[PDB]
Design a protein around this ligand. Structure first.
Ligand SMILES: N#Cc1ccccc1O
Ligand SMILES: N#Cc1ccccc1O
Ligand SMILES: N#Cc1ccccc1O
Ligand SMILES: N#Cc1ccccc1O
Lengths: 263, 264
């Protein structure tokens, strides 16, 4: 991978692996989400990091608030997918990281994604919002003119998501993380939550449709000893409303929506 | 990746990813097992496949009976690991696939692995000794002189594993696969079973030790609707454990194994 000519975005190519594909022999949306995370980390490394020494001193970290992914064509097993990523500050609110996925052979855009990140104290888990001196440190690595993977005014990535009301149409109960679901800091990987959302989609949908769009809000983290229930109701192409909540008290951890196109 | 000069082994390099590492910022044993599977798959593709046209006609597949991995140094996040793999027939019993892992910078061997595979009818699940006509088709892609990743006299890779007796010292109950644990044929990925074995190792061991050796026997498959219990008992500067995976209800065995850990 490498920073582009202007040093304001980063590109990396990936060969889709045999264990990374589903039954149609194309990459799963979780493999795609793992690759977006990987190119995001390689971008942060290439420019000196994604916390600055200032954030590290204040015990401040970046945390995902929302992930939105739209795929037109999933890369097949053995195909090379090229991914370009960049960041942009959105004022005191937080920062956005965008991605563009392309077929390396044709050069056509096969997917796009956008995420919203907020600053949080690592210990108290309190938000606080982006400070003046911290922001300045990041500004030099972001384009100043708006560069959006989803430019359209009031598009799918910015839509408010409602809370699913019981009884849910479908559910997968008692989902628990294992060591492979944790990251290097022993926290559940953000991609695991996407997998848990998808657990309550009926197999008949998975067999006859392809996932086109997924939007997922992150409200609270699932700890190593937590148990999750994944709820799904049809709201319609097929569209679904999703809710992840901790098995006991029913505390919400995530809410989202999915849009599926008939194969 | 590419077949070597003699066309009898295959090499591929991998850059360790950020989500592939544990708390030490080095690759997990499950990341390593996934990479061995990937280089095995790329080797089969580079030579025409890992079923031959005759096996597909007969509804015959290769299935793993045993996996044995020994790691000296786990590659760090960002490091390039080079893996060489080859196959050898072991008569009518079945075939063996071996791997050698190396640090791409130093050229030193950082790990090695060996696996035993048997032929099985895909539908009846019945095992069979490898026939001559099928065997002959594979022989041209394997070295004829023995090439072993574990040459040693009574090496760890060939040791018989006993059945853990209740009560187990440690256990992780109610483990279930999710869609990410399945392969392209909707079967639980062989690496998931390694993860499930490791689930019952106490966190204190994981924090103070590094996994050196894991040997795992595969007896039966966990289906999509099955639930698994992972049992572990200490059998021992080094810690050794006996492992058992069994289906949560009736207690039917799916896997047995052993692990050896060295103090960090
Ligand atoms: N904000 C921000 C940012 C920009 C370039 C690379 C890494 C980052 O976290
Ligand atoms: N997640 C998780 C986890 C952590 C330590 C032991 C077992 C687990 O499933
Ligand atoms: N047996 C065997 C074998 C050898 C080279 C590549 C793939 C194989 O299944
Ligand atoms: N394993 C598995 C699985 C298959 C279909 C739906 C949900 C699942 O966890």
């Amino acid at each position: 991978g490498s920073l582009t000519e202007d040093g304001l975005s980063y590109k990396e190519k990936f060969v889709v692996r045999s264990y990374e594909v589903g039954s149609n022999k194309t990459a799963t949306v979780e493999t795609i989400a793992n690759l977006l995370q990987e190119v995001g980390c390689n971008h942060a490394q290439s420019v000196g990091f994604a916390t600055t020494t200032t954030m590290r001193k204040l015990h401040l970290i970046w945390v995902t608030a929302r992930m939105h992914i739209e795929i037109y064509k999933y890369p097949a097993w053995g195909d090379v997918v090229e991914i370009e990523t960049w960041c942009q500050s959105e004022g005191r609110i937080g920062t956005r990281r965008d991605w563009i996925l392309k077929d390396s052979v044709t050069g056509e855009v096969t997917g796009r994604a956008t995420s919203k990140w907020v600053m949080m104290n690592q210990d108290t888990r309190r938000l606080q919002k982006v400070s003046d001196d911290v922001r300045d440190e990041y500004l030099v690595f972001c384009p100043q003119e708006p560069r959006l993977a989803f430019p359209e005014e009031n598009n799918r990535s910015l839509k408010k998501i409602p809370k699913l009301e019981d009884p849910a149409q479908y559910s997968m109960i008692g989902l628990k993380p294992r060591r492979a679901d944790l990251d290097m800091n022993q926290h559940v990987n953000n991609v695991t939550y996407i997998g848990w959302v998808l657990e309550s989609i009926p197999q008949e949908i998975v067999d006859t449709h392809e996932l086109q769009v997924i939007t997922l809000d992150y409200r609270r983290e699932c700890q190593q000893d937590d148990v999750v229930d994944s709820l799904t109701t049809t709201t319609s192409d097929s569209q679904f409303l999703h809710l992840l909540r901790l098995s006991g008290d029913g505390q919400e951890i995530n809410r989202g929506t999915t849009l599926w196109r008939k194969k």
